[PDB]
Amino acid sequence: TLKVDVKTPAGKTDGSVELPAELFDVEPNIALMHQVVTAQLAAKRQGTHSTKTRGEVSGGGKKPYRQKGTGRARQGSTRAPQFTGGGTVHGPKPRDYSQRTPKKMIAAALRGALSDRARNDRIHAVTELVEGQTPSTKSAKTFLGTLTENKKVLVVIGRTDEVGAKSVRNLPGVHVISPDQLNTYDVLNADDVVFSVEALNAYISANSK
Amino acid sequence: ARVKRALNAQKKRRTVLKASKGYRGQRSRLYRKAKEQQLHSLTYAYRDRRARKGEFRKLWISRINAAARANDITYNRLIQGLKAAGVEVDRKNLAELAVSDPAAFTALVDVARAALPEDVNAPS
Amino acid sequence: PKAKTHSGASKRFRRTGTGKIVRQKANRRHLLEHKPTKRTRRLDGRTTVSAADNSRINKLLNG
Amino acid sequence: VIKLHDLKPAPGEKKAKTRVGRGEGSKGKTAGRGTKGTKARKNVPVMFEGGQMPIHMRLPKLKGFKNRFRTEYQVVNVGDINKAFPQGGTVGVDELVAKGLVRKNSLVKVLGDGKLTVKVDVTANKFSGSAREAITAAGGSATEL
RNA sequence: GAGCCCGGUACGUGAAAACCCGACGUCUGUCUUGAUGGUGUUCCCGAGUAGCAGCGGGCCCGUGGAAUCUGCUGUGAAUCUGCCGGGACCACCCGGUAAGCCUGAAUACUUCCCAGUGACCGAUAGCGGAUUAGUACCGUGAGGGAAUGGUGAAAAGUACCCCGGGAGGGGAGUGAAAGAGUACCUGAAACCGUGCGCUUACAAUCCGUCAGAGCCCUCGACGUGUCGUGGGGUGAUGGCGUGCCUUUUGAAGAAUGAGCCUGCGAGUCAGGGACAUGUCGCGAGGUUAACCCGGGUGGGGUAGCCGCAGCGAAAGCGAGUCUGAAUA
RNA sequence: GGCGUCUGGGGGGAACGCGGGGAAGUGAAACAUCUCAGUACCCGUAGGAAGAGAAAACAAAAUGUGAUUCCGUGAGUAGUGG
């Protein structure tokens, strides 16, 4: 059981969250986390690579000269692989790279990852990043300076709280996310993780039932 | 994805053709011709490494035998005598003696003369 | 696509509980006028497949 | 702390592909096909045996038919009853589906393999006389449908 | 190698006219003279059709016991106790009411257009076509069908002089560099030559290798030149020694293939496919498909499949079952 | 039939569709039935989508479903087959 203190931009604390024990005391399985991130990246990767084999190229559909009497070798098309202009043989093709990793392996990855960060005290919470309804990236940057010094960081802000997203978007390191599409690559690439409290509550009362 | 092959070949070409500076003709310019000769060459080197032992030993023996025969003893009985006398010197060094210091070699000859059997063709 | 099955190997080959392969036996249909009954009697029943053809038959049955 | 350059699959998981026909040190000039013949140029089927009438053409066919209107039942044995009903009591198709002893669209049957000392008011479609008697001995209700 | 130079992005703006969406009011119809139920019998309920026979097509179905759907000929019925189907057929029950007609949405596709993405190529690749490209050239004709990208930051593209008929070059200049001169980024090898050192015209050489005289270069310890735990180029002379690959019982082979260089050129992909085996999660349970929501790789989705009991042709029975008169 | 007037159609298109016609090399280690494939190709007509479409249907005595089409499964199964 790990406790977190919410934090405010104006220089105060509101309250404390008492995180679960089973989500955030999982022991990581490095092979599991490896497999899953590899799958994510593979499904990201698009298969725009195609080549024209011997049967799609232009021409070649006439035996260019005799079989015998000539002196030279035997040839059946002017577009075969050994020519210069000829067909690719076993080329790239447009294909899919997704692979079907299961729900339990995925979630085990995510819980183990959040545990790896929590044990090392890199999960910070916060009510908000901003004052009312006017984005200003200088605010959020100063607040993250208060709360953090590392290069890179993750931010979990919901959908409705658009101002925090619009604010912190432009920063160099930051990589913002909604907790409905919470994943593993984006967690592990970071060093610190900033949850909103609404986000934590949603995550927890969505998983726990 | 497409991988031009240039470097990955140039490497071994450079190697071989460095190792064939001295060959005479198309064995000194062209990879497909120097590769073959490198096969034959390394092989002949191997074989000669195994056989220069016998070459030198042959040489040493000829020297020893001529030295002895000018001191009026045969090689075979010389080595019989040194074996009997438990003398340990090998043939490389007997030859070196023959070249440099024939006196010491004549002394060894005399030792063997002394230590040989009396009746060399006896039935013993 | 899928791996299609072999009709004959499905109609002349089954599998038991523990994975054995089973067949029937030969020279039973016709010309019984002269075949003694003991010869007609060891040909009844089923019989476990040989070793040598088990693999071939697996490959035919499954795909 | 973990990063992405700190992930590594388990030992022995990944394995080096055989790239065949790229060297006379590993597999060269034949690629494990040997030399000339039908298994070198192309390949060969599985259901061809030289020319002699194959096993799947010289053995008799199995006898009979199927009766397409067969009713396969899905069984439960009393062992699993005793192993997942300590308190005993009423046991229907859904009570069984709960513990995960049969399928969802099941048409059920009851059979007396294992021991029976618990008391159970079992409901199924059809039974066996061994279950009739075993329930009779453990004092229960074998009220079939 | 530009967040703060430029172009532009986040963001907000903008349309006289035309075009498309609905929105309306016109305009057009349309029911309003009406309906709910009652009650006993005649009439109608899509005709050269449905059906049957003969040749045929396609349906899981190759004429088979072969329904349903159908094409051509020939024959050819009734209207509700009517008719067609429920895998020949017959009786009962069930469902439905043919031979008249229209019907959106989910679905498939991109000549063209607009905006972007890429663990796609980067001038022998990529569209055949980065260069006049379906051109030149070939063929009578249908039809085939090529090759050629790069100066440099900006042409400041060598004014002027000398040799020469001119090309071309040497100086003088530009330029950061002309080992950037409109034959121009770099600028390999084959190939073509010029110099310097050794060696070679009494010798029989798969052209090398092991020993090695002699000469020439070099590093270092020293001493008027000198050996060395040396190293490198040539190398007289001696010994040993029958090209490479493929295919062959067996090839140096007078069996095939290769003129040489450089670049290009052959176990690949799909698929909850099959079998075997490593690894990871779960564990008597395991897992989802299509799809829906998602700026993303995430959440859901129980229809399904594999296991959990089999024997038997089958009925069927069940830790037993099949055969059999039999616990034999 | 002839004369006058009025409105239509006529051909091109990269794929996609519906109706009709309609092969062969291949596989079967030969081959004709079969398969390749009702694919390629040819024809006639379209549309921005098409065609089908309102039960003379399924089903099995469950008191069931309720136009059609396209996707997943059933299923490489029941079966068919020199």
Sequential DSSP letters for chain D = ---GGG--PPTTTS------SS-TTTS-SSTTS-SSSHHHHT---SS--TTS--HHHHSPPPP----TT----EEEEHHHHHHS-TT-EEE-HHHHHHHTSS-TT--EEEE--S---S-EEE--SB--HHHHHHHHHTT-EE---
Q: Give the nucleotide nearest to C8 (CA→C1').
A: F81
Backbone angles phi, psi at A59, to 5 degrees: 80, -150
**Owner of token pair 């049955």:** C61
Q: How far, in Å, are B33, C56, D56, D103 from residue C50 at the CA level?
A: 57, 11, 14, 37
Could you count the other beta carbons within 10 Å of the beta carbon of residue A196? Answer: 22
Put simply, the answer to whether D7 touches A116 (Cβ < 8 Å) is no
Q: Which residues of A103-116 are buried (b: 16+ CB within 10 A; e: fewer)?
A: eeebebbbbbbbbb
Q: Give the nucleotide nearest to D69 (CA→C1').
A: F78
Helices then strands, each counted (H, E), chain C: 3, 3
CA-CA distance, D135 to B86, in Å (whole number)?
104
Q: Residue A133 corresponds to which tokens in the numbers above?
A: 């309804």
Domain boundaries, chain B: 1-124
Cβ–Cβ < 8 Å for C61, C6: yes
CA distance D95 to chain C (A): 29
Of D50, D44, D63, D62, residue with least CA distance to C8? D62
Q: Residue D70 corresponds to which tokens in the numbers above?
A: 């067969």
Count of CA atoms in the C-beta half-sphere (13 A) of A65: 7
Angle between helices B6-18 and B31-70 (to 10 degrees): 20
- CB proximity list for A11: less than 8 A, separation 6 or greater: none
Q: Which residues of D touch A122 (CB under 8 A)?
A: 1
Which candidate in D4, D19, D20, D22 is best for mutational testing of the A interface (most A CBs within 10 A)?
A: D4
Q: Which residues of D touch C11 (CB under 8 A)?
A: 61-62
CA-CA distance, A26 to A33, in Å (whole number)?
13
Count of CA atoms in the C-beta half-sphere (13 A) of A197: 16
CA distance C7 to chain D (A): 9
Domain boundaries, chain C: 1-63
Q: Give the nucleotide nearest to C7 (CA→C1').
A: F81
Backbone angles phi, psi at A155, to 5 degrees: -130, 130
CA distance C37 to chain D (A): 19
Strand E reaches within 7 A of the A59 CB: yes
Specify the CATH number of the domain D74-142. Answer: 3.100.10.10
Put simply, the answer to whether D9 touches A185 (Cβ < 8 Å) is no
Q: Coil, strand, or helix at residue B93? A: helix
